[PDB]
Structure formats: structure tokens, C-alpha cells
Symmetry: C2
Subunit: 441 residues, 2 copies
């Protein structure tokens, strides 16, 4: 107790040095994150202008689509396998690991690999997100300044690694809060005390978000408008939807885990069968990117279209299954780049579908499907990644429909609740586990 | 410890269904409780106005029943606290914070009636005090009481239902779900060691609470501020400045509240009757101020939209800030039942507004609205005096829906905590918990 009294009186006194260096990490991650994003766009762009150069010979343009992305794919699968293997998949598990002191931050290897590796997979139009990549990049960015400036101490190593990861999700979504909240909900050591200064992570998130804004202002990644409010007599439908995400989450989770296994057979561990296989996936993604663009790429493009109910019911069901397919294929392949963001599209689509049904079952509720799209947008995040506070807050920061907070929070819990009750797990904790298991075996 | 972690990682987020269900119960009661507390406080402030109209001609008589009404209810509240539950004086947040450290008892049989009826006295009197503390402590004990009744066992359950209590507690106070949840996991939970507090469960509690408040309070916001103008990048540096301003003020304010506790203690020395009398004097001053200068008394939620909208002269903004600082200290440092959290929103708004004023005239190249600076400054005393910036930013966001100001709100907030740290200041709740924990041994 007299310990506590002495501790209370000492609370929130983050070492100025830790604070100042947070500012620099955030800034470096911001620029980096910005740089990564523009990079991706540019290459998605060239692949479009090359389909223009050959826009008459249909079997040929199908080819240059495939190849342009297939090649770009390969450069990434290669860049990871050869120089930094810890930069396959998301990279959140990896940095999550790092915060436990159970995996290594080889920044001199991963910064170039993840950044350029990510440039190829994403820029090739593969179904993966910049989040994991930017969270990882940001962690290593923060690690690198720790090293360079030779900051000593557990607190400095934990905090600077943390602000980098928050700054990087911030910068990838224009979600300063979601960034901060991710580190406190999910990313930090879940099972024991740690000295991570919240105020220092904040300071990093700002500089990160600010960089993003210098280069990306007057446009937002998702615009959805202002949707209707949600009647209290309407809320129970949001508990049902959360239950549907809650049973699905774990199933989807298994599938990403198992497809990891099954795709690993195709190459056995071999860098050449891998990159070859990788390029076939990546070439299929640049192919899909032309014949049916909603089945491929990041998926952000169809969130707004879906929310405004501008899809038929079939089109929705198509998009949902077509994207369950190409999400597992892309992420369980090993390719650098996350599953977080492509879940946003997955959830939005599922929700909208559920919205469509409500609208005709209950004309008395004066429903808009787009409200269920918004409740569902971070619902997969809640059921599979099991960070619903960060999901909810992210979607909020991304869609500005704050009057939907009750529906979103209800579907949120409805997902985490039923995900737990059907014995699913935190996917990023299942993956870090899967990786510490092969490490001591 | 690699092997332990692989085990732990795979067992993560598996909250006992008992705790989950009980969180829902705690939620629901905390909600009804807070709704009641709010409807109660309103009804009294009201009859008190019905009183003044009953005598709207004889000004000296009207200035009198203004005083006595608030004086009587003040006393009744001070009295309930000294006599039956002394740990229901002040905010209630340091206490429930203490409870999470297992260093202060949750005497729910005593505090539930004392805080609820004593707060109803002081708030209903029109004293300058928050509902936040009160409903946070009320909710904590509601939490404890369902723990006792259902005889749940295990640390998880205790801390959890305690945490869920205070979180659903704050959420119902403000219609602010995210802000409640966040307050638990930023400021409320134990700061220097690990704990097992299901976030999932606090979430379930918070939902139920917020839903209950929505049953009885739909369609009318605590604060309507409408949509304001955006902030240009080249304007952000002006928020960092305002942050710094709060950051030096934060700790200064803190000292006054603590010192004023000491100064006010000498007026009674501990004596229940001197104390109660002093409360009735204070209370009456407030109910008088409520008639003659309403912006200097009461909770302040009213003058928030006005300030943001630019309808106050700088003269008024200065008058309000000084006089409200003054009566905020008088009321909270006196140890009546009731918080300092909510009236720190008003103090901030005004201060922010004031800065927006001077900002607007100094920089017409910016096309400023003084109201963006008010909204920046709302969560700012929360950041500089309480050092819970992430809660204040999110709280205000929930309360004002101006998301396009997230960057300046954040920036002003960090500014506040940074300068509050640097200028040698401490979190107000923690420094009150410690003051009380230290006095526990001193004698």
C-alpha cells in the first residue's frame, strides 16, 4: 500500500527522451506509410494504362493483366523468402510477438522487404491490406530509432515499438484513435504488465496522422454519407447480425489457418515453387481485377457502393463468396500484406446483405440497409481478430455515422461474444502461437 | 516463458459466462440508477424555480427562498455523508479507483443511499458539481452489490463487475458508451500492475446502461453544438498553443482544489455540524448565484452551446471562467457529495472559446470560428487536471459529433497532458486517492 501511495504520486512521468523520440518515430512512420500508399496506387495505375495500350485484343489484354500482376506478385514472395521471412503475411502477429520479446525486429531487413514486397503484392492488385504492412514497418521504424539513438531500458524498447505500430495503422486509415486503441486492446502484452506510455503513443500517432494529412487531405478512403438513425425497436436486428458474424468468424479463422497449411504443401518450403505459386495467385488477382474488379484488390471501392444499397442481392452474395476465396488465397499464401482491411469489405458486404432482408421483412422499421453495412463493417474484425473496441472505433473514424454507435457496438459484442462461445480464437494470437510452436519444435 | 505464452495466447479472451451475464445485470441497474439520479436532480432544480415564481415580486424575499432552498438541500447532502458514508463525499472516482486497488471498501449498503440521496441534494440544490463521480461510484457499488448477492468468487469477477459498474456508470451520465469503456482502461484500472478485467464484459455492461438511458432520454442531446467548420493544416499549430495554455493551468488548478480542501477543513475541523452548516452556506450561495448570475452556478452544460456558438462577449467569457473557477473550488473542495469531472467541461469550453476569440481577430487569413477552439478546449482540463486525455477527447467526440476536429482535439489534449506533466503536476484523482490512503496511516 505505501508502495501505491508512492506510485500514485509518481504517475504519468514519461521520460522526456522517450517522448521526443516518439515524435520522430511517428513522423518517419507517417512519411513511410504515405510513401507505401502512393507506391501501391502508382503500380495499380500502370497496370490500368497497360490494359489501355492493348484494349482491343481481348485474349492479349487478359494476358498482360495476368503477367503484370503475376510478375509483381513474384517480386514480393521472392523479396520475403530470400531476405526477411518474418515479413510474410500480416506482420501484426510478428510485432505482437516483438512486444512480448519473443520475436526479433530485424529492421535493416524488414523495412526494405515489407515496403518493396508490399509494393508488389498490393500494387499487383492482390487481396491484401496495407495495415499489417504499415504496422510492421512502423514497429521496425520505431525499433530502428531505438537502436540508432541507443536508448536503453525496457520502457523505451516497449514504448517506441508500440508507438510505431499505432502510428502505422493510424497512417494507413486516417484513424488516429483506432491506432491508439489497437495497441491497448490487442497489440500490447495481453497477459502481463508492461511499461508502455499511452501519452507517448499518442504523440506518435499525431505526427503520423499529420504526415498523412499533408499528402492526402480533402479526400477520404471511404465516404458513405450520413445514414438514418436507428430506432430502439430496431436494435435487436443488430444483435442477430452480430451473432451471424460470431459463428462465421471462427469458421473463417480455421480456413485462413488451414489454407496456410494447404498452400504450404504446394511448395514444401521451396523459394522457387513458392514464388512461382505466388505469381499465379498474384496473376489471377490482376486478371480478376479486370473481368470482375470487386472480387479482387483492396475492396475499399465497393464498401460505399454496397452501403448505398447499389448492389443486387445476388451481386452481394457473389462478392462475398468470391472474396472469401481470394482473401484466403492471398493471405494464407505467405505473400506480404494483411487480412485486417480485406475484412472490412467482407463485413460491409455481409451486413448489407442482412440489411436487404430486414428492409422487406420489416417495412414498419423504415430501414436503410446501409446501416447494417456500417454495423457489419468491423464485425469480422470483432469475430476473427477479436478486437471489437478497435473495430468499432476504426469504422467510426472512417464513416462518421456516430448515430450508429449503438448498432455498431451491439453487433460488435454480438460477434466477440458468439466467437468465444463457438470456440474461435484471436487470429493474430493464433498466428503468433502457430509461429512460436514451430519455433520450439 | 515461450511455452507459457503459446498456451496463454491460445486461451485468450475466454471470459467466464457467469461474469458475462452478471455484467449485463450490473449494466442494467447502473443505467436505471443513473437515469433516476438525473431525473431526480432535474425535478428538484425545477421545484426550486417554481418557488421563485411563487414569490416573483418581493425581490429580497425571492433572493431568500432562492438561498434557503439550495442551503437546505446542500445540508441534507453533507449530512447524509458525514453521518452514514464519509467515502461518499467528493467525486467518488478516487474511491472506486481505490476499490480496484483493493485498498478501499465498497460499502454498498451505505453509499448507494448516501451518494444517491446526498448528491440529489447538492446537485439538485444547483451547486456546481458533476453527475459523473456520483454515478461512477453509485455504479461501482451497484456492481459490488451484485457480486455479494450472487456470491461470485474470484478476482476477475470482483474487479470486472467493479470496473463494469463504473464504466456503465459514466456512460449513462453522458450518453457516452466509448468514453465510459475507455475511462476504465485509461484511468480507472490499476496503473502499476496487471489485472484480469474482461473488456468484453465491461462492454456488455456499458451497452445495457446506455440502452437504459436511451429508453428515458431519447431524442434530446446533453449538448447540441451542430456541425462546425473544419481545421486547415496551417491552423493546427494554434491548437498546440492552447494545449500548452491548459497544460500550465492544469496543475495550477489542481493545487487550488487540494489546498482548498485544507482551507475548508479548518472551518469545521472535522465537526459534523460546523461542516453541514458550512455546506448549507455554500449551497445557498449557489442557489442565489443560480438566480442572479446563472452561468456562475450549476453544472454548466447550458452555457456550453452558447460559448461554442460565439454568443458570449469576451467580457462574459472572462467573468464566467473566473467565477466558475471560484465556485467550482468552493463546491468540490468542500467535500459535498459530487464530482469535478463535468464542470471541467464548461471551464474548458469557455477557456477554449476565449482563445478562439483572440485567435479569430488575430488571424483572419485563417477564417476561424471561435467554436472550434471551444470544442478543442472542452476535454482539455480533463487532460491537464485529470491526465486522462484519451477519455476526454473521445468523450467530447461522443458528446459533440464534430469528428472533423479530431486532430485539433487530440493536439490540444496532448498539449495539455505534456505541459501538465512538465510543469510538475499530477493526476487529480490519483492525488486524492493518495491523500486519503496516506491519511489512513497518519492516524
Amino acid at each position: 500500500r505505501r508502495q501505491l501511495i508512492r506510485q500514485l504520486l509518481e504517475r504519468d512521468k514519461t521520460p522526456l527522451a522517450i517522448l521526443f523520440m516518439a515524435a520522430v518515430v511517428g513522423t518517419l512512420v507517417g512519411l513511410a506509410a504515405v510513401a507505401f500508399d502512393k507506391g501501391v496506387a502508382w503500380l495499380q495505375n500502370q497496370r490500368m494504362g497497360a490494359l489501355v495500350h492493348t484494349a482491343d485484343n481481348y485474349p492479349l489484354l487478359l494476358t498482360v493483366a495476368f503477367l503484370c500482376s503475376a510478375v509483381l506478385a513474384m517480386f514480393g514472395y521472392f523479396l520475403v523468402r530470400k531476405y526477411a521471412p518474418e515479413a510474410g503475411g500480416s506482420g501484426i502477429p510478428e510485432i505482437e510477438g516483438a512486444l512480448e520479446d519473443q520475436r526479433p525486429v530485424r529492421w535493416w531487413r524488414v523495412l526494405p522487404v515489407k515496403f518493396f514486397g508490399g509494393l508488389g503484392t498490393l500494387g499487383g492488385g492482390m487481396v491484401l491490406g496495407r495495415a499489417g504492412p504499415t504496422v510492421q514497418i512502423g514497429g521496425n521504424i520505431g525499433r530502428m530509432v531505438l537502436d540508432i539513438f541507443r536508448l536503453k531500458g525496457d520502457e523505451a524498447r516497449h514504448t517506441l515499438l508500440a508507438t510505431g505500430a499505432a502510428a502505422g495503422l493510424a497512417a494507413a486509415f486516417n484513424a488516429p484513435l483506432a491506432g491508439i486503441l489497437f495497441i491497448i486492446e490487442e497489440m500490447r502484452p495481453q497477459f502481463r504488465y508492461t511499461l508502455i506510455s499511452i501519452k507517448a503513443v499518442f504523440i506518435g500517432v499525431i505526427m503520423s496522422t499529420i504526415m498523412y494529412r499533408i499528402f492526402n487531405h480533402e479526400v477520404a478512403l471511404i465516404d458513405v454519407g450520413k445514414l438514418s438513425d436507428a430506432p430502439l425497436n430496431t436494435l435487436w436486428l443488430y444483435l442477430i447480425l452480430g451473432i451471424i458474424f460470431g459463428i462465421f468468424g471462427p469458421i473463417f479463422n480455421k480456413w485462413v489457418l488451414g489454407m496456410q497449411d494447404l498452400l504450404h504443401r504446394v511448395h514444401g518450403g521451396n523459394i522457387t515453387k513458392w514464388v512461382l505459386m505466388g505469381g499465379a495467385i498474384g496473376g489471377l488477382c490482376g486478371l480478376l481485377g479486370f473481368v470482375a474488379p470487386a472480387t479482387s484488390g483492396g475492396g475499399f471501392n465497393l464498401i460505399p457502393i454496397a452501403t448505398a444499397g447499389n448492389f443486387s442481392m445476388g451481386m452481394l452474395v457473389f462478392i462475398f463468396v468470391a472474396r472469401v476465396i481470394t482473401t484466403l488465397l492471398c493471405f494464407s499464401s505467405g505473400a506480404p500484406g494483411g487480412i485486417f482491411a480485406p475484412m472490412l469489405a467482407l463485413g460491409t458486404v455481409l451486413g448489407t446483405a442482412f440489411g436487404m432482408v430486414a428492409v422487406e421483412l420489416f417495412p414498419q422499421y423504415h430501414l436503410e440497409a446501409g446501416t447494417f453495412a456500417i454495423a457489419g463493417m468491423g464485425a469480422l474484425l470483432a469475430a476473427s481478430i477479436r478486437a471489437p473496441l478497435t473495430g468499432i472505433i476504426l469504422v467510426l473514424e472512417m464513416t462518421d455515422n456516430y448515430q450508429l454507435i449503438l448498432p455498431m457496438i451491439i453487433t460488435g459484442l454480438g460477434a466477440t461474444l458468439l466467437a468465444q462461445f463457438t470456440g474461435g480464437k484471436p487470429l493474430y494470437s493464433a498466428i503468433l502461437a502457430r509461429t512460436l510452436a514451430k519455433q520450439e519444435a
